[PDB]
C-alpha cells in the first residue's frame, strides 16, 4: 500500500519473464529506486536506473528502455495514463499516509460556504482518502459530486496540474484536498467556480482568488504585444507532444503578420533557446512551464490559450489543459501493469 | 566570423531528394544562422522545424527526433559526418573559420622549430580547410609534416575531436596543435606521450602543454574515489556516445573488487540530475569531456581502471571507431544509412 511492494513487483516481473528492467523515479524516490534495484538483482534480474528526473506518467522511459535492451520498465511514483508503451510497464504510485478527515472536520464551517452539492478533488497521493472524505461530507449533510476524469486521469476525483476534467461536473463549489497553490488555482481558472483548498497537514484553508494570477498573465501577453518573431515549442515527451496544436499556432501567428517557427525539444527551458532571435515564446506542451515560471524565462512565454487572446481571438482567460478521451476503466489503488 | 552558410547548395540537395519537412539542429554558436536558414528554406516551400536542444557534436544527430515529428530530412549545422546509422537523410554543414592559420604559424616559427624536424600536425574542424596550406608552409620551413588519416569517428585526415586523437597516432618527434583552447592539446599530450605545442590561430598565442597539473588534479578525484563502496556507472543514449558493453564491463569489474555498482541511463549527462541517488562515486562511460571538466568524484573508465589497480599509467578516455573508407568533403555532405 504505502510501502513500495517489492514482492508484488518481483512476481509481476517473473510472470512476464522480464530479465532486464529500467526504473524511472521522481526526485523524492531516488533512494527507493536503488533499493528496489538491489533487491531485484539479488533475484536474478538485471536492473538499470533511468538517470533523468521524471516529472509524470506523461513521460514514460519505454523507448529508452527498448534502446538499452530492457524488456520492461518500472515507473515509480505515478500511475498510468493512456499512452502507447513499447515495453511492458509497471506503475508504482505513491500514497501519502495522512488522514484527511481531521482537516475537513476542523474547517466544516468554511466548507458549508461552498453550498449543498460540492465537487471534491485531490491529487494522486491522497486519492485513496477520497472515499473517507466522501463518507464524512455526506455524513455532515453534503451531496458529494466526484468526476471520473478522462484518459489522462487514473482515478475519479484526481486532478493533474494540466488536467482538471474530474471537476467539470454538476456542483456549486469545489473542495480541493491537498498542499500548495497551483492545483487549486488551476481549478478556479479552469472551472470559474468558487474553489476551497484545505491542506490536510496544517488544516489551513484558502479561498482561491485567481485575479492576481490572471493579471500576471495579462501583463505577460502585454509584453508580447510588441513581438514580431515567435518560437512555438513542442516537447517530444510521449504524453506532451502536441504537434497539430503547435502547427496550428504557427499558422495562426503567420495569419496575423507575425513570424513563427516551430521548435522541437524534450525538456523545455529558456537557456537552450536564448541564442535564438525570437522575441516571445509559445509553449505548446505542459502548461506548467509557462504558467509556473519561477523566473527563468527572460522573454515573454505564453500558452496557446493566451496566444489567442494576444491575436484578439478570445475575450476571456481560459486555462491551457491537456485533455484525454473517455476512460472506460479505473486504475488500481496499487501497482498496475500495462503493455500495448 | 565563419564562412557563410551555403543556402543554395543545401536547398538543391533537399529538392534532389524531394524533402518537404526538415529538422535543423545547431550548436551554441550557430543559433542565429539556424533560423536564417529556416526562413530561406521556408520561403522556398519547405516546412522547417528548429531543434531547441544545444547540439554538441555529430555524435548526436537528431534523426530519431526528426522521424518522430514527421520530418523527412535532417540538417546538422556546424559539424562533419561521423560514421553512424541514420534514420532520415541528413545533410552535414561544417563550419569553417575565416582566420588565417599560416599567419599564426609565421608569428611562432621559432617555437615550432623546438618541436623537431619531423612533426605531427593536427587541427579541429574549423581550420581543417586550411590544413593543406599550413602543411605547405611548414614544409617550406624545413619540417617533415606527418598527418594521420584517423578512424571512422574522424571526418578528414589531421582532424582531432575532444574524444578521439587517432590522427595523431603516427610517427613523429612532436605534435603541433592548431586551434583554440587547452582540452584538445591536453588529450593529445596524454594520448600520444609526446611533446605538444598549441598555437591559437585567433590570437597567434602559443602554449607548451604540461599535462602534470591535469593528471595530479585527476588523481585527487581517484584518491577521493578510493574510499567509495557505491558507484554509479552512466551511459548516454546519444547514438555516437552509447557505450553499453563497456559500461556493463565496468559494473562487473567494480563488483568483482567488492564494490557496489549500478548502470544509469541518460541522454545529457548532467551531475545535477544525479544528486538524489545514493552513490558515493560516479563513472561516466560516454563523452569523456564530462568527467574531465563536481561534488562526488566522477571518473572516466580509464581512471576507474586505475582505482581498481588494473592500470598504472594515466590514460585519456577516447571513443575509437574502426577504419575509415573515404574522406568527408570540404563542404556540405549528405548521408542516409
Ligand atoms: C510536477 S510535473 C510539472 C513540473 O515538471 C516540469 N516539467 C513537466 N513537463 C516538462 C517538459 N516537457 N519540459 C520541461 N519541464 C517540464 C515543470 O517545471 C513543471 O513545474
Ligand atoms: C562542445 S563539445 C562538448 C561540450 O558539450 C558538453 N557535453 C558533451 N556531451 C555531453 C553529454 N553527454 N552530457 C552533457 N554535456 C555534454 C560538454 O560539457 C562539452 O563542453
Ligand atoms: S501537469 Fe504537465 S508534467 Fe504534470 S502530469 Fe500533466 S503534463 Fe505531465
Ligand atoms: S563525444 Fe565529446 S568530444 Fe566526441 S564529438 Fe561528442 S561531445 Fe565532442
Swiss-Prot record, chain B:
<keyword id="KW-0479">Metal-binding</keyword>
<dbReference type="GO" id="GO:0016765">
    <property type="term" value="F:transferase activity, transferring alkyl or aryl (other than methyl) groups"/>
</dbReference>
<feature type="binding site">
    <location>
        <position position="287"/>
    </location>
    <ligand>
        <name>[4Fe-4S] cluster</name>
    </ligand>
</feature>
<dbReference type="Pfam" id="PF01866">
    <property type="entry name" value="Diphthamide_syn"/>
</dbReference>
<dbReference type="GO" id="GO:0051539">
    <property type="term" value="F:4 iron, 4 sulfur cluster binding"/>
</dbReference>
<protein>
    <recommendedName>
        <fullName>2-(3-amino-3-carboxypropyl)histidine synthase</fullName>
        <ecNumber>2.5.1.108</ecNumber>
    </recommendedName>
</protein>
<dbReference type="GO" id="GO:0046872">
    <property type="term" value="F:metal ion binding"/>
</dbReference>
<dbReference type="InterPro" id="IPR042264">
    <property type="entry name" value="DPH1/DPH2_2"/>
</dbReference>
<dbReference type="GO" id="GO:0090560">
    <property type="term" value="F:2-(3-amino-3-carboxypropyl)histidine synthase activity"/>
</dbReference>
<comment type="similarity">
    <text>Belongs to the DPH1/DPH2 family.</text>
</comment>
<dbReference type="InterPro" id="IPR022428">
    <property type="entry name" value="Dph2_arc"/>
</dbReference>
<keyword id="KW-0408">Iron</keyword>
<dbReference type="GO" id="GO:0017183">
    <property type="term" value="P:protein histidyl modification to diphthamide"/>
</dbReference>
<keyword id="KW-0004">4Fe-4S</keyword>
<dbReference type="InterPro" id="IPR042263">
    <property type="entry name" value="DPH1/DPH2_1"/>
</dbReference>
<dbReference type="InterPro" id="IPR016435">
    <property type="entry name" value="DPH1/DPH2"/>
</dbReference>
<keyword id="KW-0949">S-adenosyl-L-methionine</keyword>
<keyword id="KW-0808">Transferase</keyword>
<dbReference type="InterPro" id="IPR042265">
    <property type="entry name" value="DPH1/DPH2_3"/>
</dbReference>
<feature type="binding site">
    <location>
        <position position="59"/>
    </location>
    <ligand>
        <name>[4Fe-4S] cluster</name>
    </ligand>
</feature>
<dbReference type="InterPro" id="IPR035435">
    <property type="entry name" value="DPH1/DPH2_euk_archaea"/>
</dbReference>
<feature type="binding site">
    <location>
        <position position="163"/>
    </location>
    <ligand>
        <name>[4Fe-4S] cluster</name>
    </ligand>
</feature>
<keyword id="KW-0411">Iron-sulfur</keyword>
<comment type="pathway">
    <text>Protein modification; peptidyl-diphthamide biosynthesis.</text>
</comment>
<comment type="function">
    <text>Catalyzes the first step of diphthamide biosynthesis, i.e. the transfer of the 3-amino-3-carboxypropyl group from S-adenosyl-L-methionine (SAM) to the C2 position of the imidazole ring of the target histidine residue in translation elongation factor 2 (EF-2).</text>
</comment>
<comment type="subunit">
    <text>Homodimer.</text>
</comment>
<dbReference type="GO" id="GO:0050843">
    <property type="term" value="P:S-adenosylmethionine catabolic process"/>
</dbReference>
Amino acid at each position: 500500500l504505502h510501502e513500495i511492494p517489492k514482492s508484488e513487483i518481483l512476481k509481476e516481473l517473473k510472470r512476464i519473464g522480464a530479465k532486464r528492467v529500467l526504473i524511472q523515479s521522481p526526485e523524492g524516490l531516488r533512494r527507493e529506486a536503488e533499493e528496489l534495484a538491489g533487491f531485484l538483482e539479488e533475484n536474478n534480474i538485471e536492473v538499470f536506473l533511468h538517470g533523468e528526473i521524471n516529472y509524470g506518467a506523461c513521460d514514460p522511459a519505454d523507448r529508452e528502455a527498448k534502446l538499452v535492451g530492457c524488456d520492461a520498465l518500472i515507473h515509480l511514483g505515478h500511475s498510468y495514463m493512456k499512452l502507447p508503451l513499447e515495453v511492458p510497464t509497471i506503475f508504482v504510485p505513491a500514497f501519502a499516509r495522512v488522514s484527511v478527515v481531521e482537516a475537513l472536520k476542523e474547517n466544516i464551517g468554511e466548507i458549508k460556504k461552498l453550498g449543498r452539492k460540492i465537487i471534491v478533488t485531490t491529487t494522486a497521493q491522497h486519492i485513496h482518502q477520497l472515499k473517507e472524505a466522501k463518507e464524512f461530507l455526506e455524513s455532515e449533510g453534503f451531496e458529494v459530486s466526484i468526476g471520473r476524469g478522462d484518459s489522462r486521469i487514473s482515478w475519479p476525483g484526481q486532478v493533474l496540474g494540466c488536467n482538471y476534467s474530474v471537476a467539470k461536473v454538476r456542483g456549486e463549489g469545489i473542495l480541493f484536498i491537498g498542499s500548495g497553490i497551483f492545483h487549486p488555482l488551476g481549478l478556479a481558472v479552469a472551472t470559474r467556480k468558487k474553489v476551497l483548498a484545505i491542506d490536510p497537514y496544517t488544516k489551513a484553508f484558502s479561498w482561491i482568488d485567481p485575479e492576481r494570477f490572471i493579471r500576471k498573465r495579462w501583463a505577460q501577453i502585454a509584453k508580447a504585444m510588441d513581438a514580431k518573431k515567435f518560437g512555438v515549442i513542442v516537447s517530444i515527451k510521449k504524453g506532451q507532444l502536441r504537434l497539430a496544436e503547435a502547427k496550428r499556432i504557427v499558422k495562426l501567428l503567420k495569419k496575423h503578420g507575425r513570424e513563427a517557427r516551430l521548435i522541437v525539444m524534450n525538456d523545455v527551458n529558456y537557456h537552450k533557446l536564448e541564442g535564438f532571435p525570437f522575441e516571445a515564446y509559445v509553449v505548446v506542451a505542459c502548461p506548467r512551464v509557462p504558467l509556473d515560471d519561477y523566473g527563468a524565462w527572460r522573454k515573454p512565454v505564453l500558452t496557446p490559450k493566451e496566444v489567442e487572446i494576444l491575436l484578439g481571438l478570445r475575450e476571456e482567460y481560459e486555462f491551457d489543459e491537456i485533455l484525454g478521451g473517455p476512460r472506460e476503466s479505473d486504475e488500481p489503488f496499487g501497482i498496475s501493469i500495462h503493455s500495448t
